[PDB]
Design a protein around this ligand. Structure first.
Ligand SMILES: NC(=O)c1ccc[n+]([C@@H]2O[C@H](COP(=O)([O-])OP(=O)(O)OC[C@H]3O[C@@H](n4cnc5c(N)ncnc54)[C@H](OP(=O)(O)O)[C@@H]3O)[C@@H](O)[C@H]2O)c1
Ligand SMILES: NC(=O)c1ccc[n+]([C@@H]2O[C@H](COP(=O)([O-])OP(=O)(O)OC[C@H]3O[C@@H](n4cnc5c(N)ncnc54)[C@H](OP(=O)(O)O)[C@@H]3O)[C@@H](O)[C@H]2O)c1
Lengths: 333, 333
């Protein structure tokens, strides 16, 4: 097991064990992200690298790692890596798609429902004792929320996660609108999803769910202008990336009644704190837990081991991101 | 509009307006439940009565209401009314089924996902600034929750709400088990739901959802013995009636790890406070808001008016509960 690999955070043990007999494994042990200073130092003799979304694996990193031929991100997204600079150095970059799809769609719907029906607020009300204090049991007009069944959901990014979200929406007999770079008719057919230019999707939707990678294009896709297109009753759900939304524009819309509420799993800076946003009652927040299900994180761990182990054996990584590097160099150490 | 009617709480105005031109409408205006003292006094000259879940419409009430010939409950459940004593006195009792089905199923699934994925907890963590304070952005083992998609759900009471919940479960490709008093083949066929004696449903389900009315039989159906039957990974969802569950047994199961967590919308006493339960992080609570969607509450108001207006025109109420009273006396004032 000559191949050296450094994992920047403690992923589920199943992945670690899978790599044991094939690699010399070292793993960062503190919960907080690893300081760059230390990282630059630990990547000197490594062949493989397993990083997290929060870590920025740019050019400076690839420089201090002369022997690094593969970087397996422990996420499906990969906007934290400079994939262009890596394809140049013949460095393979993998990710973990599909294994975390259901957990992320499951969380998107939890947010949609929690926001639409005020579960967080109602919980605080009960748990704090306030409900008991008030002496009121049940009231016709208390915590009135929005209907979900039969409503129109507009998925922005009908990819692996987007499609999973649409499959669930069918269970809520929703009318499914979606905006995406292309139209895959076999997908439109199976899900009964209808393409709509972004402006139309924003105008006709009761729930708008973001599920696109973060790129130059998607950066601030949801701005103060597009926020005005949505209905005053619509709710926005973001389980994509924090920067796909203009927080300031969003905070304005919520305070100004442009839309009804928001469920946010991601933010422009993580961790995040914003007194204004957090004062709001029509907002539900979670600390980037989209893929946090026992099953998903375990599957991610196993998929990363598969990619690194296939690369060892001179094979194209099952979930290789930049296939254009197959040319610059072939699989191996 | 000779007929007099007294609504015990301010239901959506659309219902009041519908009755305004056919009845002499009076409505209790405080938000807290009307004191019995005042109530007994207000029902003296009333022909119709519109009550809430919170009010106990027993014999003592039917007495002080010599003209009262119809009590429209503003709820689908009716365990708050002494239906027996009413059918005796020739008093028609109606409820509001179907109009609130979707809102309750929607809330039931919202609790399911929020408990499974720690939504409430995650929000407190983010909102309180604690997440920012700790310095960790994203961690492989943080807030790990349970998968929903593909899992097994056991619906106890496959009625109007139960079936709605099963329709949504299909959206999560769940395997649907269900315990109920009878088996309706056409329903099993449409939902792909499989009957299972209560005991098997409890051992095989990852999510147990209660949707039965409160009765002698269902009283404390979920006790310390049946809770031991559930998986240590299972989650219990109660959107039925607080007393269908033995809170004490539940609190025990939760602290002891007999089951993973609970999502509760109803309680044995409302409003409710319980320091032990509320200290728990694997419990999600909401103040009996199951039917609190704009559409549901509005449809309930309109349905109650349709019932009262049909009874006036000498017709059998569309959603008449106690049909055995059709004999004791015909429809009218
Ligand atoms: N919150 C969490 O815990 C969590 C968990 C997992 C993933 N995520 C986020 O979810 C993202 C997507 O995940 P996925 O697996 O579903 O990836 P994916 O399938 O590759 O992407 C989904 C869709 O985004 C579309 N898209 C890309 N750029 C677009 C643009 N400019 N305009 C419109 N549509 C665009 C893609 O269309 P085409 O492919 O046809 O161009 C694709 O249909 C990840 O990249 C990550 O940022 C968050
Ligand atoms: N939390 C909220 O905000 C909220 C909102 C609305 C309603 N609710 C509660 O939900 C209850 C059910 O609503 P629904 O419209 O679905 O009523 P439903 O359709 O009349 O009843 C649902 C099911 O319960 C079954 N059942 C009754 N007794 C049982 C027993 N002893 N063992 C097993 N199954 C039994 C019934 O079977 P059978 O057909 O064989 O009798 C039926 O299949 C309401 O009565 C109310 O208590 C709560």
């Amino acid at each position: 097991m000559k191949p050296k690999v450094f994992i920047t955070r403690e992923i589920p043990e199943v992945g670690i064990k899978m790599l044991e007999d094939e690699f010399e494994v070292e793993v960062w042990g503190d919960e907080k992200e690893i300081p760059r200073e230390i990282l630059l130092k630990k990547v000197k003799e490594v062949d493989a690298l397993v990083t997290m979304l929060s870590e920025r694996i740019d050019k400076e990193v690839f420089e201090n790692a002369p022997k690094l031929r593969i970087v397996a991100n422990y996420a499906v997204g990969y906007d934290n890596i400079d994939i262009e600079e890596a394809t140049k150095r013949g460095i393979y970059v993998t990710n973990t798609p599909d294994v975390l799809t259901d957990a992320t769609a499951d969380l998107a719907f939890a947010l949609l429902l929690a926001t639409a029906r005020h579960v967080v607020k109602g919980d605080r009300f009960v748990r704090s004792g306030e409900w008991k204090k008030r002496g009121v049991a049940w009231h016709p007009k208390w915590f009135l929320g929005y209907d979900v069944y039969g409503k129109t959901i507009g998925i922005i990014g009908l990819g692996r996660i987007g499609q999973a979200i649409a499959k669930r929406a069918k269970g809520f007999n929703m009318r499914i609108l979606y905006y995406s770079r292309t139209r895959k008719e076999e997908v439109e057919r199976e899900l009964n999803a209808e393409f709509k230019p972004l402006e139309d999707l924003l105008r006709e939707s009761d729930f708008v769910v973001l599920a696109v990678p973060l790129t130059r294009e998607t950066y601030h896709l949801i701005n103060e202008e597009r926020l005005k297109l949505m209905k005053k009753t619509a709710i926005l759900i973001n389980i994509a990336r924090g920067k796909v939304v203009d927080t300031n524009a969003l905070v304005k819309a919520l305070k100004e009644g442009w839309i009804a509420g928001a469920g946010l799993d991601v933010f422009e800076e993580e961790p995040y704190y914003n007194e204004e946003l957090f004062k709001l009652d029509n907002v539900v927040l979670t600390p980037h837990i989209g893929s946090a299900s026992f099953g998903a994180r375990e599957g991610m761990a196993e998929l990363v081991a598969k990619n690194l182990i296939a690369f060892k054996r001179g094979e194209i990584p099952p979930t290789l991101v930049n296939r254009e590097v197959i040319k610059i160099r072939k699989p191996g150490f």
